[PDB]
Scaffold this active site. Structure first.
Site, PDB file in Angstrom:
ATOM      1  N   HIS A  60       0.713  -1.249   0.192  1.00 48.46           N
ATOM      2  CA  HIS A  60       0.225   0.064  -0.026  1.00 48.46           C
ATOM      3  C   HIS A  60       0.735   1.135   0.047  1.00 48.46           C
ATOM      4  O   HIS A  60       0.611   2.004  -0.873  1.00 48.46           O
ATOM      5  CB  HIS A  60      -0.960  -0.089   1.087  1.00 48.46           C
ATOM      6  CG  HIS A  60      -1.381  -1.511   1.453  1.00 48.46           C
ATOM      7  ND1 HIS A  60      -0.835  -2.372   2.410  1.00 48.46           N
ATOM      8  CD2 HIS A  60      -2.417  -2.195   0.925  1.00 48.46           C
ATOM      9  CE1 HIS A  60      -1.309  -3.523   2.419  1.00 48.46           C
ATOM     10  NE2 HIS A  60      -2.372  -3.495   1.648  1.00 48.46           N
ATOM     11  N   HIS A  90       4.652   6.473   7.773  1.00 49.18           N
ATOM     12  CA  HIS A  90       4.509   6.462   6.156  1.00 49.18           C
ATOM     13  C   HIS A  90       4.074   7.647   5.640  1.00 49.18           C
ATOM     14  O   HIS A  90       3.608   8.668   6.044  1.00 49.18           O
ATOM     15  CB  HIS A  90       3.547   5.396   5.982  1.00 49.18           C
ATOM     16  CG  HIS A  90       2.132   5.585   6.530  1.00 49.18           C
ATOM     17  ND1 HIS A  90       1.948   5.389   7.864  1.00 49.18           N
ATOM     18  CD2 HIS A  90       0.949   6.037   5.938  1.00 49.18           C
ATOM     19  CE1 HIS A  90       0.752   5.830   8.226  1.00 49.18           C
ATOM     20  NE2 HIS A  90       0.285   6.073   7.295  1.00 49.18           N
ATOM     21  N   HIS A  92       1.147   9.214   2.360  1.00 46.11           N
ATOM     22  CA  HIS A  92       0.163   9.060   1.032  1.00 46.11           C
ATOM     23  C   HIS A  92       0.604  10.136   0.226  1.00 46.11           C
ATOM     24  O   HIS A  92       0.903  11.237   0.491  1.00 46.11           O
ATOM     25  CB  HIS A  92      -1.088   9.039   1.628  1.00 46.11           C
ATOM     26  CG  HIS A  92      -1.641   8.220   2.796  1.00 46.11           C
ATOM     27  ND1 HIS A  92      -2.127   7.130   2.659  1.00 46.11           N
ATOM     28  CD2 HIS A  92      -1.087   8.109   4.214  1.00 46.11           C
ATOM     29  CE1 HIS A  92      -2.465   6.494   3.676  1.00 46.11           C
ATOM     30  NE2 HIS A  92      -1.923   7.218   4.975  1.00 46.11           N
ATOM     31  N   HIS A 115       2.207  10.671   8.012  1.00 39.39           N
ATOM     32  CA  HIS A 115       1.646  10.134   9.332  1.00 39.39           C
ATOM     33  C   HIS A 115       2.782   9.438   9.935  1.00 39.39           C
ATOM     34  O   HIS A 115       3.264   8.471   9.573  1.00 39.39           O
ATOM     35  CB  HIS A 115       0.605   9.167   8.778  1.00 39.39           C
ATOM     36  CG  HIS A 115      -0.399   9.847   8.114  1.00 39.39           C
ATOM     37  ND1 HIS A 115      -1.312   9.025   7.413  1.00 39.39           N
ATOM     38  CD2 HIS A 115      -0.939  10.957   8.082  1.00 39.39           C
ATOM     39  CE1 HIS A 115      -2.388   9.953   6.786  1.00 39.39           C
ATOM     40  NE2 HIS A 115      -1.924  11.134   7.289  1.00 39.39           N
ATOM     41  N   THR A 194      -6.844   5.587   8.354  1.00 41.95           N
ATOM     42  CA  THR A 194      -7.350   5.636   6.960  1.00 41.95           C
ATOM     43  C   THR A 194      -7.319   4.436   6.102  1.00 41.95           C
ATOM     44  O   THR A 194      -7.676   4.567   4.912  1.00 41.95           O
ATOM     45  CB  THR A 194      -6.873   6.977   6.404  1.00 41.95           C
ATOM     46  OG1 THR A 194      -5.340   6.778   6.038  1.00 41.95           O
ATOM     47  CG2 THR A 194      -6.892   8.372   7.295  1.00 41.95           C
ATOM     48  N   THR A 195      -6.781   3.322   6.480  1.00 43.93           N
ATOM     49  CA  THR A 195      -6.828   2.073   5.489  1.00 43.93           C
ATOM     50  C   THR A 195      -7.452   0.871   6.552  1.00 43.93           C
ATOM     51  O   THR A 195      -7.784   1.245   7.775  1.00 43.93           O
ATOM     52  CB  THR A 195      -5.342   1.342   5.490  1.00 43.93           C
ATOM     53  OG1 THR A 195      -4.767   1.117   6.661  1.00 43.93           O
ATOM     54  CG2 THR A 195      -4.475   2.544   4.580  1.00 43.93           C
TER      55      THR A 195
HETATM   56 CO   LIG Z   1      -1.640   6.912   6.946  1.00 38.03          CO
END
Ligand SMILES: [Co+3]
EC number: 4.2.1.1
Length: 256
Positions: A60, A90, A92, A115, A194-195
């Site tokens: 991801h 990580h 996005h 994040h 958010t995942t």
């Molecule tokens: Co995140």
């Protein structure tokens, strides 16, 4: 689950009903609507004893993992009670500079969002923390394209070795303080991961001041792969969920 057309964000609710929950993330931050809160204490980001140990491509995004078996790197204060340990960070990002962030500000999208995930030490471990309403505190920092971020380059220059799903590489001695902006002014609201599984266990702390990264820097992110080795090539881009209903929440501001 994924970000594609047949398994993207608007599909997650079928395996994961909490997607249409009451405290889902991310959200849009309407600045004239956020109320200044003075009873908020200043943020305290204690990262000088941080121990990074690996980076991994998980299909991801890429996670930079830390030693959380002790109270090394910890977040406290702000809207937080007790002490929160850093476990990983990580990003996005998008396929183009005009999108990529998860949070937005007065509908504006940044090229990417960082994040920094922390779990509350009163619950002993991250697995138990995600089952609690104040289980996590995530630091969210926006990226804009401009001049490069010196603190980021060492991350950028390892992605080649972890290009496909499942690959990892030792990442020690990385200091996450080099990814922070000058100001700690922030917004905060109660929210979720958010995942998938989208658990509603997160106190969100979103900095007002973005960091600047270079176009070259962001394009190396865009070279990663969602797929596994020897698999058909699909670039890791647009791994962001769009903004969710704010519903019954109040966003608070630390600054006047
Ligand atoms: Co995140």
């Amino acid at each position: 689950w994924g970000y594609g057309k047949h398994n993207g964000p608007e599909h997650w609710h079928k395996d994961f009903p909490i997607a249409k929950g009451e405290r889902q993330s991310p959200v849009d931050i309407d600045t004239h609507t956020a109320k200044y809160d003075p009873s908020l204490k200043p943020l305290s980001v204690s990262y000088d004893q941080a121990t990074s140990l690996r980076i991994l491509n998980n299909g991801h995004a890429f996670n930079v993992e830390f030693d959380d078996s002790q109270d090394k790197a910890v977040l406290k204060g702000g809207p937080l009670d007790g002490t929160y340990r850093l476990i990983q960070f990580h990003f996005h990002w998008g396929s183009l500079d005009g999108q990529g962030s998860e949070h937005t500000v007065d509908k504006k999208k940044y090229a990417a969002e960082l994040h920094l995930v922390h779990w509350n030490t009163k619950y002993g471990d991250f697995g138990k923390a995600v089952q609690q309403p104040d289980g996590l505190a995530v630091l969210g920092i926006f990226l804009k394209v401009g001049s490069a971020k010196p603190g980021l380059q060492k991350v950028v220059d390892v992605l080649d070795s972890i290009k496909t799903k499942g690959k990892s590489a030792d990442f020690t001695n990385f200091d996450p303080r080099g990814l922070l902006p000058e100001s700690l002014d922030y917004w905060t609201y109660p929210g979720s991961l958010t995942t998938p599984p989208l658990l509603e266990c997160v106190t969100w702390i979103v900095l007002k001041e973005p960091i600047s990264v270079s176009s070259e820097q962001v394009l190396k992110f865009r070279k990663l792969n969602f797929n596994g080795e020897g698999e058909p090539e699909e670039l890791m881009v647009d791994n962001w969920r769009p903004a969710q209903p704010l519903k019954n929440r109040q966003i608070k501001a630390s600054f006047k």
